[PDB]
Amino acid sequence: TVFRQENVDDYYDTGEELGSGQFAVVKKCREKSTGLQYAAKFIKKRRTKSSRRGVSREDIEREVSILKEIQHPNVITLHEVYENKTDVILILELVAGGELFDFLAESLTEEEATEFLKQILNGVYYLHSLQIAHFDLKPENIMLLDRNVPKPRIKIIDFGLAHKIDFGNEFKNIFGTPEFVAPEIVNYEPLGLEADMWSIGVITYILLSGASPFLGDTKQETLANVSAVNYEFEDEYFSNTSALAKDFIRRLLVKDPKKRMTIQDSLQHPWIKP
Numbered sequence: 042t043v044f045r046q047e048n049v050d051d052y053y054d055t056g057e058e059l060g061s062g063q064f065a066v067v068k069k070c071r072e073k074s075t076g077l078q079y080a081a082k083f084i085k086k087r088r089t090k091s092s093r094r095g096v097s098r099e100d101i102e103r104e105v106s107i108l109k110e111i112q113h114p115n116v117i118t119l120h121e122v123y124e125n126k127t128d129v130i131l132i133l134e135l136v137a138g139g140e141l142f143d144f145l146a147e148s149l150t151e152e153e154a155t156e157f158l159k160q161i162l163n164g165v166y167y168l169h170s171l172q173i174a175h176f177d178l179k180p181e182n183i184m185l186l187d188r189n190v191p192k193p194r195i196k197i198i199d200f201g202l203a204h205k206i207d208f209g210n211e212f213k214n215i216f217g218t219p220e221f222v223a224p225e226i227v228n229y230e231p232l233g234l235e236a237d238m239w240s241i242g243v244i245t246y247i248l249l250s251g252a253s254p255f256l257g258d259t260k261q262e263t264l265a266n267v268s269a270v271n272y273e274f275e276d277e278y279f280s281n282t283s284a285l286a287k288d289f290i291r292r293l294l295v296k297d298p299k300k301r302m303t304i305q306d307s308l309q310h311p312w313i314k315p
């Protein structure tokens with residue numbers, strides 16, 4: 042699919058930088074015709090077929106196709122797409138409360154954690170209902186609408202690894218952040234919606250304790266820990282945490298994807314179900 046090739050600067054004014062990554066930068070922007078504000082993610086294109094720099098057309102088009110499908114309070118909304126020779130530019134809904142990652146850097150109670158988790162679960166329920174696996178769930182990829190309220194609302198972002206799972210699994214060598222990836226990703230096995238539920242388990246552990254369950258001193262150690270399900274609930278962190286909360290995590294951090302809680306299971310779990 043081709044995108045709008047008019048100069049984005051003719052329709053938007055950019056401002057504050059909102060984020061930055063390997064082949065992308067995100068800038069706050071304002072549409073001239075409406076005065077409405079957005080986030081513009083500029084994604085560098087591949088300059089040749091066999092280069093490893095920039096993002097392939099295939100990966101870019103997959104991400105745009107998924108973003109065009111989704112409309113839910115807990116997932117980011119895509120407004121427009123532009124492109125030129127160097128970049129594809131996603132004009133995205135503006136979310137101004139920063140990353141959950143940065144909010145966490147400033148441990149929650151179980152209520153505060155479930156407040157966040159319920160919204161993450163609802164957003165993932167929407168995605169999995171459409172057979173969309175996100176494949177990169179982590180606190181950095183959850184944004185807050187406003188971080189100065191008692192119960193911040195959240196939106197899932199960063200669908201750069203997301204895939205439609207129309208055959209129950211995909212076999213693609215998809216691979217996200219070592220701390221959060223499921224064993225099947227570490228082992229290069231076929232992947233499905235189940236991998237997101239493992240990631241939710243890691244996120245939950247972090248929300249409750251401020252600690253990462255599998256994190257080693259090197260990437261290879263972290264990956265080895267993940268594959269071996271090498272984690273435990275340290276008493277220093279979890280002594281005041283309910284056994285039901287631990288049960289929720291335990292049923293997600295399960296190596297066999299078929300035995301892992303599904304998104305529907307997670308919403309019906311006694312720790313979550315009201």
Ligand SMILES: O=c1cc(-c2ccc(O)c(O)c2)oc2cc(O)cc(O)c12
Nearest residue numbers: 059060067080117134135136198199200
């Ligand atoms: O960093 C941000 C990143 C993204 C984002 C959203 C969806 C994607 O598929 C993606 O690849 C990136 O959306 C935002 C939306 C915002 O309002 C503010 C932001 O910082 C971001």
